[PDB]
Write a structure and sequence with these properties.
Chain A: This is Nitric oxide synthase 1. Two copies of one chain form a homodimer. The first copy, chain A, is α+β, with helices and mostly antiparallel strands. Chain A contains ten helices and 18 strands. The first copy, chain A, folds into three domains: about 160 residues, Nitric Oxide Synthase, Chain A, domain 1, CATH 3.90.340; about 100 residues, Nitric Oxide Synthase,Heme Domain,Chain A domain 2 (Nitric Oxide Synthase,Heme Domain, Chain A, domain 2), CATH 3.90.440; about 90 residues, Nitric Oxide Synthase, Chain A, domain 3 (Bovine Endothelial Nitric Oxide Synthase Heme Domain, Chain: A,domain 3, Alpha-Beta Complex). A four-stranded mixed beta sheet of chain A has the order 3-4-15-12, with helices on both faces. Chain A has a three-stranded antiparallel beta sheet with strand order 5-8-9, with helices on one face. Chain A has a three-stranded antiparallel beta sheet with strand order 14-13-18. In chain A, α1 runs antiparallel to α2, α6 packs across α8 and α7 packs across α8. Chains A and B meet through β1, α6 and α8 of A and β1, α6 and α8 of B. The complex binds protoporphyrin IX containing FE (2 copies), ligand XVO (2 copies), 5,6,7,8-tetrahydrobiopterin (2 copies) and zinc ion.
C-alpha cells in the first residue's frame, strides 16, 4: 500500500513506501490527531532478553542490507553471535561499524530535524570505554574542540556506554553542552536565560560558584555508571562566542548581547537495535532563527523584543503596527550578520528549508520516503515564504532513533 | 483517555473530554500522522435510507440538550416525526431553529478556523426556497450587502436547498464570492491572480468578456438544481475594495495594489444531521496575513516580494539578508493600515490568535474541549511570537461540519 504527498506551490507529487517499514507508534488514532503535542509519551522514554533479540535482528537486517551483504555468511554468523551473547549475558555489544551506521541513521530518521541533508557526514566518537565523570568531561572537551573547529563547524556525536539495568546509567545532566545560566531574583525578575533557572539552581546546590551574570556558561554536570553527578567547567578557550551587532544599527551592540557558536544537544536517548544509549551528546551548527526568534524573542526566554522595539522607536501602543514582527526581523538580521562576520558557521531559514526540500525529494527517490514533522520543520518566522510550508509531509517513527527521556534529577537515586 | 493539552509559554493545562464525542475520522493512524495533508479523503464529500436516521438522531439529541430539553416531550416527538418523514420521503427538512443551530455549530467545530470566538453571532439566511440561478444571484447580492455593511463587517451564511439525489445539486462555482481574475500571457507569465486562471478561463469559455486587468472582479457562476450554470456580475457598489498604501512609504501607493474587504468562501459543503448543503456561501472579515502573506507574497500568487524589496533598496543578492522577511512585514503593515484607514473591519494576527487562546479557554471550560488544527491555526508569519505557536491542540472531527467537495466542472454533466 502506497501513499502520496503533494507540494502545493510546485505541484510535485511523491510516493512514500518507507512508512511500511515503520513499527513504533505515532500517538495519533483514527479519531484524534496529536500532531501538535510536544512530548507525547511515545516519543519519550529497562528491556529484557524477551524482546531484545528481534530488535537486534531487525537492526542487523537493515545494517547488512545497507552494505549489500544481506543473507551473507557474515550476516548469518553475526545474528548467531548476537543471539548467544543475549541469552548468556542478557545484552549485546555493537561493532564499531554498526554503531556508526546506527548513529547516522538515528539522525536520518529524526523527523523533526530540518538539517538532515547532512546526515551521512557525521563524526562519531566512540566513548563506550568511559567509566568516570572525569572520563566523560575529557570526551566532551574533545567533542567541543573537534566540532567547533575555530568556527568552521563539523557535526559530531559522542556515545557513552549503553544502559544495562537502568541503575548504572551514564547521563549528561545539562540539556545542551553549552548554555547560559538563569537566575531568579527575589523581586521576581529573571537574570540570564529563564529556560535554565531550574538547572542553574541544581548546579549552585552541587557547589557551583555562580558569577550571576547575564551570559555565564553553565558547568558540565556529568553522571557515570549511575554514580552521583559531578561538576566540571568547560575551558573558556573551547567555548566559541559571537558578540551580536547589527549591520545598520550602531546602537545594537550596546544591548550587550552575545551567543555561543555550537548547538550541542545532550539530554536525548539514542536507540540502536534495542540498545539504549542514555548519554549521547550531538552537535551541528545553528539555523539563525533558533537564536534570533526562539532564544532572544520568546516571551519566556530573553524576551528582548521590547528593548529592541524601543531603540528602533516603533509604534508600540497597538499591536497592529506589527512592531513585534519588525523588531524580530532586525534581531534575526543581526544574529546572521554577527556569525557570518566572525566566520562562524550558520544557515538562514530560507537556505535550510530549500536544502531540506531537496533532501526530502532525494530521500523519496532512493529510500522510498522521508518521515517529516511539519509542525517542527516549518521555521518559527516567515513560514509561508519558505518552501516547506507548502510541502505535505508524512510523520512516522523509524529506528534507529533519538528519543526524549526524563530529566535525571527526577529519577536519580542519590548516594550521598 | 481524558486527554490534556499544555501551553508551553504559560504552563496552562486544559483537559479535553469533548473529543470522545468525535464521530468521523482524521486520516491518521498510530503508525502514521497525516496532520500536514491538505485534503485527506475524509475532509471531502447520496444517503441510503438507513444511514440517514442515526445521523438525524445524533444531531437532534445534541440540539435538544443545548436547549435543556433532552428527553422531553418535544424531544421524542420531533424524533418520531423525523423518523416518520425519513421512512417515507427518504430525507427530511430541518426546522428553522435547527438550521440556525446546525450552521453555528459547523463553524464552532471548524478546527482550522482561528476566528471561531465569534461563532455564536452568525447571521443565517435561509435560502432553501430558491429554485433558479437568478434567485441564487439575488440571495447572494443580499448576503454581500448585509455582510459588508458599509465596512462594518458582519458574519453571515446563506444556505441553499439541500442535496436530494446528487443530480440536482445547487452549487456556487466560484471558490469565493469575490475574487480577482487571472490571465495567462503570451510570454508564459501570468497577469492577475494565478490561483484563478482555470476559473477565469471557464468564465470566458462561458461568455464573460474579461477587462484583462490585474484586479478584475470575477463574475458569479451559479448552478441551480443541477442545471448548466449562469454568469452574473456582482454590482460594483456592493464590492467594497481597499487601495493599499503604507503609513511611512509614500511610494507604496504607486505599486497600484488593492484588495476587497469581504472574504466569502463559497465552494464548501455544509453537513447537518446527515443532510448535505452543497451551496452555503459564508463570510466573515479578513485576518491581515491572509492578504499580505499568502495572497500577495505566495510564489504561486501575486508574488510581489521582488518589487517591494527593490523599491525598498534592500540587498537582494543573499537570502541571509532576510530581505524577503523585511519586505513581508512592511506589506502586512500596509494592509492593516489601509483597511483601518478606510474603516473596513480587519484583525491582525496577534489579536486573532490571542482571541483564539481565549476562545479555547472558554470552550474547554463550558464545552469540554475545542478541536484545533495547529498547522492551520498558526499564522504564516511571525509564528512563534503569537501565543498559538506554544499551544498544544487536539484535532478531531465533530459534526455539524463544513467539508470540502469536488470542483463542479469536473463533475457536471455539461
Ligand atoms: C547540521 C546542522 C543542523 C541543523 C541546522 C539542525 C536544525 C534543527 C532544528 C532547527 C531543529 C528544531 C529544534 C528546535 O527548533 O528546537 C532540529 C531538531 C532536531 N535535530 Fe537537527 N540540526 C542539525 C544537526 C543535527 C545533528 C548532527 C543531529 C544528531 C546527530 C540532529 C538531530 C536532531 C533531532 C533529533 C531533532 C529533534 C528534536 C526533537 O525531537 O524534539 N540534528 N534540528
Ligand atoms: C469572522 C472572522 C473570521 C476570521 C478572522 C477567520 C479566519 C480564518 C483563517 C485565517 C482561516 C485559515 C484559512 C486560510 O488561511 O486560507 C480560516 C479557516 C476556516 N474558516 Fe474562519 N474566519 C472567520 C469567519 C468564519 C466564518 C463566519 C466561517 C463559517 C461560518 C468560517 C469557517 C472557516 C472554515 C470552515 C475554515 C477552514 C476550511 C478547512 O477546513 O480547510 N470562518 N478562518
Ligand atoms: C523542547 N525544546 C527545548 C527542544 C529543543 C531541542 C531538542 C532537541 F532534542 C534537539 F535536537 C534540538 C535541535 C537543536 C539543534 C541541534 C543541532 C543543530 C541545530 N542547529 N540545532 C532542539
Ligand atoms: C487551501 N485553501 C485553498 C483553502 C481556502 C479556504 C477555504 C475555506 F473553507 C476557508 F474558510 C478559508 C478561509 C477564508 C476566510 C473565511 C472567513 C473569514 C476569513 N478571514 N477568511 C480559506
Ligand atoms: C505546542 C507546539 O507543538 C510547540 O510549541 C512546538 C511547535 N513547533 C516547534 N518547532 C520547532 N522547531 N521547535 C519547537 O520547539 C517547537 N515547538
Ligand atoms: C502542505 C500544508 O498542509 C499546506 O501548505 C497548508 C499548511 N497550513 C496552512 N494554513 C493556512 N491557514 N492556510 C493554508 O492554506 C495552509 N496550507
Ligand atoms: Zn496525526
Amino acid at each position: 500500500r502506497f501513499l502520496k504527498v503533494k507540494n502545493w506551490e510546485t505541484d510535485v507529487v511523491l510516493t512514500d513506501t518507507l512508512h511500511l517499514k515503520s513499527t513504533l507508534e505515532t500517538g495519533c488514532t483514527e479519531h484524534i490527531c496529536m500532531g501538535s503535542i510536544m512530548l507525547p509519551s511515545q516519543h519519550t522514554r529497562v528491556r529484557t532478553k524477551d524482546q531484545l533479540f528481534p530488535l537486534a535482528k531487525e537492526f542487523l537486517d537493515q545494517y547488512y542490507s545497507s552494505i549489500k551483504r544481506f543473507g551473507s555468511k557474515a550476516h548469518m554468523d553475526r545474528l548467531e553471535e548476537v543471539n548467544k551473547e543475549i541469552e548468556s549475558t542478557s545484552t549485546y555489544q555493537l561493532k564499531d561499524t554498526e554503531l556508526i551506521y546506527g548513529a547516522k541513521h538515528a539522525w536520518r530518521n529524526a523527523s523533526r530535524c530540518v538539517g538532515r541533508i547532512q546526515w551521512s557526514k557525521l563524526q562519531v566518537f566512540d566513548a563506550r570505554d568511559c567509566t568516570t565523570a572525569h572520563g566523560m568531561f575529557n570526551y566532551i572537551c574533545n567533542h567541543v574542540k573537534y566540532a567547533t573547529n575555530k568556527g568552521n563547524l563539523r557535526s559530531a556525536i559522542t556515545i557513552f556506554p549503553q544502559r544495562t539495568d537502568g541503575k548504572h546509567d551514564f547521563r549528561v545532566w545539562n540539556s545542551q553542552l553549552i548554555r547560559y545560566a538563569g537566575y531568579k531574583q527575589p523581586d521576581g525578575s529573571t537574570l540570564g536565560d529563564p529556560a535554565n533557572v531550574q538547572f542553574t539552581e541544581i548546579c549552585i546546590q552541587q557547589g557551583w560558584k555562580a558569577p550571576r551574570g547575564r551570559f555565564d556558561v553553565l558547568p558540565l554536570l556529568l553522571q557515570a555508571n549511575g554514580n552521583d553527578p559531578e561538576l566540571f567547567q568547560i575551558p573558556p578557550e573551547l567555548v566559541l562566542e559571537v558578540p551580536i551587532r547589527h549591520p545598520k544599527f550602531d546602537w545594537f551592540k550596546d544591548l550587550g548581547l552575545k551567543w555561543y557558536g555550537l548547538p550541542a544537544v545532550s539530554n536525548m536517548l539514542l536507540e540502536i537495535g534495542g540498545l539504549e544509549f542514555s548519554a549521547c551528546p550531538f552537535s551541528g551548527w545553528y539555523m539563525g532563527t533558533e537564536i534570533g526568534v526562539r532564544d532572544y524573542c520568546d516571551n519566556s526566554r530573553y524576551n528582548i523584543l521590547e528593548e529592541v522595539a524601543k531603540k528602533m522607536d516603533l509604534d508600540m501602543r497597538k499591536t497592529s503596527s506589527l512592531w513585534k514582527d519588525q523588531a524580530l526581523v532586525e534581531i534575526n538580521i543581526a544574529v546572521l550578520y554577527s556569525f557570518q562576520s566572525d566566520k562562524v558557521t550558520i544557515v538562514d531559514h530560507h537556505s535550510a528549508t530549500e536544502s531540506f526540500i531537496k533532501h526530502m525529494e532525494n530521500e523519496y527517490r532512493c529510500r522510498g520516503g522521508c518521515p517529516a514533522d511539519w509542525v517542527w520543520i516549518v521555521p518559527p518566522m516567515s513560514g509561508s515564504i519558505t518552501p516547506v510550508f507548502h510541502q505535505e509531509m508524512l510523520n512516522y517513527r523509524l529506528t534507529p532513533s533519538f528519543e526524549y527521556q526524563p530529566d535525571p534529577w527526577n529519577t536519580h537515586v542519590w548516594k550521598g
